Amino acid sequence: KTKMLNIKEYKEKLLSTLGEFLEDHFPLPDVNLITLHEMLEILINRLFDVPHDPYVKISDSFWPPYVELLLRNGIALRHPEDPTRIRLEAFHQ
Amino acid sequence: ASLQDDALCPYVCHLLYLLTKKENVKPFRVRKLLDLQAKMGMQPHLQALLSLYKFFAPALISVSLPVKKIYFKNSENLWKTALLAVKQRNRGSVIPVLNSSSYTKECGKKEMSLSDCLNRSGSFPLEQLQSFPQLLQNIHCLELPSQMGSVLNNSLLLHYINC
Amino acid sequence: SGFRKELVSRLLHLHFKDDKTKVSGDALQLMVELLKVFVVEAAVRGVRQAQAEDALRVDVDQLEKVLPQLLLDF
Amino acid sequence: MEEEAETEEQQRFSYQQRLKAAVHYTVGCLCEEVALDKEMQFSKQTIAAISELTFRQCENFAKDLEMFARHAKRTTINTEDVKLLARRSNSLLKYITDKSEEIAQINLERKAQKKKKSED
Amino acid sequence: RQNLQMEIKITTVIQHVFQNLILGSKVNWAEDPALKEIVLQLEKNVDMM
Amino acid sequence: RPRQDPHKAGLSHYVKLFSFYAKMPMERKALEMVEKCLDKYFQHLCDDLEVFAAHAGRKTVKPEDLELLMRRQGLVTDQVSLHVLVERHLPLEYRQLLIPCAYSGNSVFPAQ
Amino acid sequence: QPLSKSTRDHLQTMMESVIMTILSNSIKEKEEIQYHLNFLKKRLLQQCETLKVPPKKMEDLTNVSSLLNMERARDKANEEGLALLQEE
Amino acid sequence: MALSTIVSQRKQIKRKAPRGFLKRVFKRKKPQLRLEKSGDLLVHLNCLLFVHRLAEESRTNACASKCRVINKEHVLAAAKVILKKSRG
Hints:
This is part of a larger assembly, with eight protein chains of eight kinds. With 163 residues, chain B is an all-alpha fold. Chain B contains seven helices and no strands. The longest helix of chain B has 14 residues, at 27-40. With 88 residues, chain G is mainly α. The radius of gyration of chain G is 21 Å and the shape is elongated. Chains in contact: A-B, A-E, A-F, B-E, B-F, B-H, C-D, D-F, D-G, E-F, F-H. The PDB classes it as cell cycle. Keywords: Chromosome, kinetochore, cell division, centromere, cell cycle. The entry is titled "Structure of the human CCAN CENP-A alpha-satellite complex".
């Protein structure tokens, strides 16, 4: 439990700081466009909920300059055959 | 991340050669290096870095390298003459080769051991053992070679097999 | 001996991506002989291949040999 | 809805054969018009092969003209757009533009006739 | 134990995602002390914790 | 005592890159006529760029003219865009100038 | 036993060809004529699929003519050769 | 290795593009034009895809003739198809 307590405490601090960082440096952009922080949550969940098929289809909500930001730094990858679908990098493996 | 830019690639490879430890090698970083190799081909400074990655994680990469040429060019740096002043201030096979224990240890494992989960003790890696004071502390727990004939010309392992 | 004016327009409107696309009469007129030249040119090439093969008549096999070169030219 | 959709698909399918039959009727006439001076006989399958080839070539032409017109911000295709498509063959380009000049001359003649009607 | 196998994996992913966002934003993290100490902790493994 | 034609300096870049993709030993006589192929491509490439620009009514050559050409070449299709092709074949430093990405307060460079 | 899939493949194909030919020469009354012809075609497909025939082997209809021509050529060559040998 | 035959390049040179060369060649042929600052890079991209096409087609011809060394008649045949395809 003590190992769990430290791990869970660490994750909450990490997640809380990440949310503050996005609000200060990437405000909501000026069909409705969702924010970058909302985009990240979609990709992360799909990676864990569906381990075998984590690909997500690009929609009009994702306005392209944000998509290039994730793709350039290595956080996201296009599907090798269909460039319409992107996934999240498997960091834990 | 600087490996992406072609201008700094040879120099970053030299820097990453020294800093690399076991914790740094991770599977996702292993895929990045292979991707860079497809785009640029057989770059000598990449071949050195890949070999260091194979040594730490042989279960991920397999490299056979031809034979030892100097991969990183030993060009005279701008501060080489000054280092001489700084150094003055500071001054003023029949037998098998040594290799870590065979990586079929663990191999297919359902889950980590309870002792490992609690971070209890462990073993001393063979590469770290290079001095007699280091042998004195860790005589009771050691990692044996893959092939036991390599102990023949290693003086520090003879002290272990003496008793 | 030529394609009908209405016939050509029917084919083009079938494959337009956007319905807002319209074809002017003079341009639609000029399209008519363009298809005719394409059909005429294909027949001539088949005759050339048949004469080289010295065949008594043009068949499918001779047509296929000169088929891909025509598409690249057009 | 589903029964209606397949009928519309059938109507779309049926509309193809009417164009196919008209094209095949026209192509067959041209092949015979090629036969007499070339004194060469064409197998019936060859005319069918040409008919399919000509039908598939209209798809490439249709998209390019729409693409070219959109480049110039023109919703309607003009004569200038068609001249672009013919540039792959220099010999064909010279031949096709001569007819365009001939059509322009005829249009000028038509305009001259209209002026004469206005005077009368 | 199965809870350990899942909380560790999630924390690892958040660590590396947060690292790359800081790099791509092109900001001077060393200037802010509050953000500075977060950066140093990202590389450290959660297993040792 | 070397003297090099500046025209041959440019072609030598693509000629070496040719031998990388071929993955076969290649005869020396094949080298120079590949150089003959390259200049012909450049000459015909520039001629085509005239008409597309001339058709639009502007003499200056803008990137969308290059997009229109490659679509006719078959390189660019509905699935594969212009941005996708840059990502696959070009280094990072060239990517920044071409493909726009927003960062640091929604600032986008280049503006799009 | 039912006949082979090739028979229906070939007969189907030749019926689309002949339907295309007969619609080529017709001007008016398109939809009704093509609907009736398609109904007749599909019903004939059903009838021929239901049909029963003693087993047999058939080669494709497209290539019978050429192979037949080479068979006559071989016929003539072998006949003249045998006649010459017999005379000797 | 003989001077006449060059072995395949194991390592590709740095992916840096000769930007200066492209500007002058475009300048001399059509002096009247002005090209946008980033137009040189896209032209370089267009040239890569051309050379990539040329290398693939030449290899097929050499393998078709059972030749282990790419020869001049193989690549000239490759040039005719690609050059027409490359113009649009």
